[PDB]
From a paper:
[name] is an endonuclease belonging to the type V RNA-guided CRISPR–Cas family. [name], which is a thermostable protein identified from a hot spring metagenome locus, functions as an RNA-guided ribonuclease (RNase). [name] adopts a bilobed architecture encompassing recognition (REC) and nuclease (NUC) lobes.
The crystal structure of apo-[name] was determined at a resolution of 2.24 Å. We observed a single [name] in the asymmetric unit of the crystal structure. Apo-[name] exhibits a compact domain arrangement that differs from the extended conformations observed in apo-Cas12a. In the apo-[name] structure, two zinc finger motifs are located at the Helical 1 subdomain II, namely, the HCCC-type zinc finger (His248-Cys252-Cys323-Cys330) and the CCHC-type zinc finger (Cys228-Cys240-His335-Cys339). Fortunately, the structure of apo-[name] determined in this study provides an intact view of the Helical 1 subdomain II, which consists of helices α9–α17. In the inactive state of apo-[name], the lid motif is positioned above the catalytic active site, obstructing the catalytic core region and preventing substrate binding and cleavage. In apo-[name], the lid motif interacts with the Helical 1 subdomain II and Helical 2 domains and is held in place above the active site through hydrogen bonding between residues R661-R224, E666-R226 and K672-V632.
Author numbering: 10 to 544, 622 to 708, 744 to 760
Write the structure that this text describes.
Amino acid sequence: VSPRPRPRYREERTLVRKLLPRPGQSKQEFRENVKKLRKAFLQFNADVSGVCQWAIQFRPRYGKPAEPTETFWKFFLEPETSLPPNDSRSPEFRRLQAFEAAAGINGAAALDDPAFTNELRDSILAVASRPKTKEAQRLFSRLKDYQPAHRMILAKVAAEWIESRYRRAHQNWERNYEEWKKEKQEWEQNHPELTPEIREAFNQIFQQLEVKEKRVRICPAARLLQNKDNCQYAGKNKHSVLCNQFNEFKKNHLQGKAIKFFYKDAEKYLRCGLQSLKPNVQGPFREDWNKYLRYMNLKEETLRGKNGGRLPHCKNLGQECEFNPHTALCKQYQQQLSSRPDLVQHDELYRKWRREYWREPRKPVFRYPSVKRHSIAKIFGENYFQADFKNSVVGLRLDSMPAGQYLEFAFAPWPRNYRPQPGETEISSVHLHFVGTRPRIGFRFRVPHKRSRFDCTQEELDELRSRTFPRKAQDQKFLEAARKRLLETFPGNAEQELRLLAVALGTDSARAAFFIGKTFQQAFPLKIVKIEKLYTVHTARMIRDWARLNARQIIQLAEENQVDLIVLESLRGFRPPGYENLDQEKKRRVAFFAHGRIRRKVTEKAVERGMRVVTVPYLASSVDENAARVLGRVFWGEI
Ligand SMILES: [Zn+2]
Ligand SMILES: [Zn+2]
C-alpha cells in the first residue's frame, strides 16, 4: 500500500487571543517584551521567506523536462507520500534531514536511512551540487547555528506555505490551461470565418489603441458606422446628462398629459410659435416652459438654433440617444475601421473570441508571506511555551533563551461559550503574529472531523471541480461525476435516504430546501441580508462578517436536519460588455468575492461536522421563490 496524501481540511483549530500586560508590570516592561516578540516575528518571516526564495528555484516549469532537482521539490512539499508508514520518525523530521543535506547545512550521511529512496538521494545531491546565491549562503550560514527544532519548524512552514498557496493554484491552473487550449481549438474549428489573419488584424488594432482588456468598452463597429452621437459609454445609462436631467424634470415638475406631450409641444412651440399649440394647452405650456428653461440651464435663444426648433436631449430614457457623442476611444476605433471596411463584418465575432480565447488563464506567480497581513505565525512548540488558563498567563521562550526561562504575558481569557474549553483538549503549540503593532497568540489544538456517512473526501469533490472538470463548459460533467461519487460512497440507497440541504444564493431569495433522496421534504426560512446592503481591493471588509454569520445559519439549519450534503448555487455568469455602468461591474465583482467566501466557510465547517458540499451552476432560467427546490432537482438531474 503506497501512503495517502495529507488532508487539505485540517483536523485542528487555533484560538487567537490578545496578549495583555501581566497585572503589576509597567507599560514600559510590556513594551520592551512586545519589542522582543516583534523582532522574533519579523526574524521568523525573514527566515521562512529566505527558505521559500531558495526552494522556489526548483519548482517544475510547465511544458519542460523534469529537472533532476524535481524529486527533492516534491518531497520538501509533501514528504508523507514517499516515506514508509511504519517510519519511527515524523515526515516533518525527514523533511528537516532532506533540507539540511540539500542546503549543505549537513552531509548526505543522515540520508543513508532506508526511509529515503535513491531517486530522492540523487535529487538532493543534484540540489546540493548547484552554486548558491549570496542570499542563500547568508540564510544557510544563519540557520546552521539554529537548534534543530527551529530549523524543523522553518522547513515545515516554508514547505506548507508553498504547497498550500502556489502549488495547489499551479496544479489547478495547469488543468484549466490544458482544457482552455482544447476548448479554444474547438471554438476556432467551429468558427472558421474568424481566421488567423483577421484575428491578427484586430489584435494589432487593439494593441495600437491601448486596450489590454479582454472585454472592449467600445461601441459596436456597425453602431459606430451610423456616424451619429450615440455611444453607450459616454453618458450615464447610455444617454447624455441632459437626457437624464429631463427625465427628473418630467417626474418632479410635469403632471397628467404634460408628462407625455410636453416634449412634443415644446418642439412644436420652438419651430411654429405658441399659436401652433392647441388653444387648451397654450396656458399650461407657458408655465411648464419657463420652468423647463430654469430647471435645465437652457436659453430659448440658443434652442431655436438647432434644426429649426429641437430640444438637445432624448424625450425618453427607453430610446437609443442621439445627443450622446462617442468617447475618444470609440472615435479612434472608428478611425481604424474606416481604413479597414473589410474587418467591420467580423467585429462582433472577434470580440466574442477575445473575451474567451485571446488571453490564457493567468499562470499563478509565487507570493511571499506578508508581514502586514500576518500570513504566517512564529511557532512555539513543546519546550518553548507554558500556558496557565486559570490565571490566563502564557510564557514564550525565544529561540536562544535557556530552558525554563520565558517572557510572560497575560492574554484575553478563553471565552466560556467557546466549545473546546482548555481542559477538554491539549495545546500542542502557540502561534505568534502581529496585527499592526498589537501582539496576538494562537492556541493550536487537534479536533477530529465528525465522520461523514459518505466514504468520500471533500478533497475529491474539490479535485473534480478544479482539476478533472475545470471549465464552465464542463459544468454538466462535473455535476455528473460528483453525484456519481457521492451516490456510490453513500452506505444505503442514496436516491431514497441521502439527506441534502439546497440553499439558493445571490438574486434567488433567502430560502432553503431539505430533501431525503430525490424527495423534496420541507422548505425552511433562512434570514440572509443581500450584498447590496452593508455598504488592496478594499480593507473595510464587512464581507468576512457577512460570510461567517450567514455560513453559521446554513450550518445550524443543516445540523438541525442531520444533513449529509449541502448544495450551493454559484453566482450568475458574467454579462457581455455595454449595459454595464462601471459601478455595477464593481458591485457584481464584490458579490462574486463575498459568495466565494460564504462557500469556502460553509465547506470548511461542513467537513468538520461530517458533511460534504457541492456548488451547482447558476440557475439559468429562460414570480415567487421555488429556487432552492429547483436547485435540489438540478443536483438529482431531473432538470
Ligand atoms: Zn461609442
Ligand atoms: Zn438621450
